[PDB]
């Protein structure tokens, strides 16, 4: 048996077997009083010391939210839906670390990603145990609201201020400081990691001044705060949140008598009415989100960004080859997982429709041309492949450079990686490619269980991943520097040099993406 004393009382957790080796998992650990009644949507309350054993030998509950139903039975889409009861109840957290404990191991902080209406550290493929045995790290994750019910907004108003979510990973990080040594990790070597709307959540705690003292370093999968999706203005924020009140009938006028309408609500009542508080959609709209809260965030964070307003430390950003192909398929017309998606030019102009809606018809033309001048123009691919690159340049790709080269300007060393291995478990059709989400499970080195059907290849891949990633936590340096691999050299303002991941081989290359760029980063916010 292991029973850790931690700062709120004793915990057990579970024995497991990894790889001839053995790893200590606390799963489902609470990191605050349960959001409920009067507590939903204010920020996380601490919480009241046990006198008890608490047995974190589970996963907890996820948070409330609407499940992807599109593609039933299909587990390209379902393996990424929650694996555990929903519930309000749900700030919780997990612990995975090396048997025999450690003396002061490096941690890793988790935070997935799911467009802030989604997501639960419980899946499958943000299981710590391999890192944990491999590298010898502690890893942490956490639950945070999403939807409404984390990041609904009257700005000022502490019955609903907004960013919720945002201070339950905060206050989850402050757990890590209070407890970590404990379970014998180094709260002084704290490295944050997350993919998506995850790593656009740790792009932003490199800006909140309440986190500069939670962490040391930061690593950034496909997702920063600059993406034209991450943070809401207190406009639309207000707007939502009194579009939402309507829709429950909640509509009053003193506003804090909406709040207390809305606590009344049903879990459910909520959930099935955060899709409408927008007046148009795409399968990118972030219905609730961060805003501009003058707590955790106090300045509109591009400002923040180009005038050097952030925690000066170590940044690790990528993104992979195909990020925009995963949402063509939730909307676009003529696109099919389940076939392979040869679309027309006219079938193009109204995909724009519907990743652009409210642009000008002048914006989507603009779109249309410095997308569509091919070299083959007979290429029957040029419109599906150019529509999955529009929607991965403007919303990841982009945004992900562009952090980079304004964060780098002040200092700091930074590495920026290009994923371009397909997965050989894949379960999405070919021509979808590399795509959104699919770095993660090599990032936890899923492909290092032989028994998991990988191939050689793959597990090469991802025993290299693994290294870089946590000899970047341990030393803020990316390198794997044994087995004769590729330099990565920091990412620098004028030359702006970055890493391919494949099993192929391993290049530096220069300025991605370079071309289209410059469209979204300097024509196209104009329109
Ligand atoms: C690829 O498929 C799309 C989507 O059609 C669905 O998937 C197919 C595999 C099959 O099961 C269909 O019955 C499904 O509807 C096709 O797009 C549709 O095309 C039809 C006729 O061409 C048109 O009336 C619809 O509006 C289109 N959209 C939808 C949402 O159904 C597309 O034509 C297929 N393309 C190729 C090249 O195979
Ligand atoms: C990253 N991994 C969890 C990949 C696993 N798959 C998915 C699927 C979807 C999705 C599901 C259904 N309809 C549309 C999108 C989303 C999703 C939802 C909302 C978003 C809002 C703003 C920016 C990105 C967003 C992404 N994110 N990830
Ligand atoms: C907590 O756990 C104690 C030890 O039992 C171990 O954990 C439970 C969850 C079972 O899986 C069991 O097989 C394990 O050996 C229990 O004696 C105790 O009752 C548990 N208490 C609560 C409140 O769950
Ligand atoms: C702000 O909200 C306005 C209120 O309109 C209501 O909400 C929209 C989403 C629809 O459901 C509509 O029929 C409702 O009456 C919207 O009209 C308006 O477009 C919203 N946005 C802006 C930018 O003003
Ligand atoms: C390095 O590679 C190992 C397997 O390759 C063998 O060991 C290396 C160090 C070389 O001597 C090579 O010629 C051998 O064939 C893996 O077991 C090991 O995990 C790898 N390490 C990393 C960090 O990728
Ligand atoms: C852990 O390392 C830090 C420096 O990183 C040092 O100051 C601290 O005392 C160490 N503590 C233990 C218990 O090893
Ligand atoms: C709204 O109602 C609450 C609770 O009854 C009260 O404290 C507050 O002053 C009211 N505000 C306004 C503007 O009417």
Known sequence: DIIIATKNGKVRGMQLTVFGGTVTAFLGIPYAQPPLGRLRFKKPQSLTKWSDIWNATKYANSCCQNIDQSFPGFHGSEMWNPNTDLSEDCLYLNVWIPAPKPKNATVLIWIYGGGFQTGTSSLHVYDGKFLARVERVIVVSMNYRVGALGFLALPGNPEAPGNMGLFDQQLALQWVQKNIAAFGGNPKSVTLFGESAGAASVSLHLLSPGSHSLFTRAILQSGSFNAPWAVTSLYEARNRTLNLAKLTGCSRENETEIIKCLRNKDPQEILLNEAFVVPYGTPLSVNFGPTVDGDFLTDMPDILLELGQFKKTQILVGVNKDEGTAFLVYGAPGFSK???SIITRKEFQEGLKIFFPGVSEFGKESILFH??????????????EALGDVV???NFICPALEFTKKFSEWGNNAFFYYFEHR??????????????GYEIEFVFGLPLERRDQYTKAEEILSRSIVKRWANFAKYGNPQETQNQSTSWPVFKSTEQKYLT???????????????????????????
């Open 392 to 394: 991965g340049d403007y």
């Open 338 to 340: 389940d076939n392979n």
């Open 501 to 527: 991941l494949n099993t192929e081989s391993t290049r530096i290359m220069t300025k991605l993406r370079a071309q289209q760029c410059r469209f979204w980063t300097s024509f196209f916010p104009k329109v």
């Open 423 to 436: 997965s050989s478990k894949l379960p999405w059709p070919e021509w979808m490619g590399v795509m959104h």
């Open 371 to 384: 997308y569509t001048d091919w070299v083959d123009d007979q290429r029957p691919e040029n419109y599906r």
